[PDB]
Amino acid sequence: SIVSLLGIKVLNNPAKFTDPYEFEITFECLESLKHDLEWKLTYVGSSRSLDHDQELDSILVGPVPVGVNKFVFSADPPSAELIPASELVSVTVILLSCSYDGREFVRVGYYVNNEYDEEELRENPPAKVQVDHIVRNILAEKPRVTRFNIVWD
Template identity: 50%
Template structure:
């Protein structure tokens, strides 16, 4: 059966942002028929292309029951837990997945690749062995004096973070699955929605890494 939900638009409101900032997604979707149960939205941070062990579900939200028509809401989710990411994978390319389920069946996921890069040029050229993701340069606070001008403080605020993330919104990948929207539909008409999710994560991240490398090469030409 055709999908009863159409995701019209997803705007990432704080992009680019500090690595430690929350994700803020403004989601607009349309229902073609009333759904008596909740839609479950889930935001996943994928850092490894070889294992789902390091995938992090940042947050989930239930929306519903939802009447027919167009709807909009803002989905806030925390940044990934750095302690759960391998050190060598913190800086570089990652994947952000927005998944939506109905009645415990995933029917769509949207994927973007995310670049996590240092702001400071020196750190870009000579990245430390232990990635720096703290929000502020703590040593700066010790050097700020009470008589500093507002202009100086404003300029300093632009340097008060190490790592910045950028969601590449122009390279959106969408995968859909057929599901049972009502219990009366025959189960054998529909494949398992989540059957190959792990393989999809791996393929998606590999594909994004390749695309991102090509993107960087083009920028240097």
């Protein structure tokens, strides 16, 4: 691997469902690359009969200097209209990945708990979901990292 992930911090946690995800990412690039790096955030929800996946946001970073790199990725929140009501207040996953020329080489997975912010709503969840009352809590200190060997240049 030409790129090593050195640190990753969620800056705003817990947060509203509709708040952007702020990831402070520290990495090192060990030699010059021809292309930019593409950071992506993916939502994965699990309902009874299928998963729902959403590409939440992506950003191209480059040209990448050799050595240490650090930035905050502020990723757009999910499109709630694409998520079943029951899944909006469930445990879900987000996957933060980096790719090179379209090839994913690192993936950082997080558990996320979503619940209503009022006792009455938690115990009597309404038929018509009230997204402004949903709070997310990312399990930010226990990242689930996967690395993949890729072709670089």
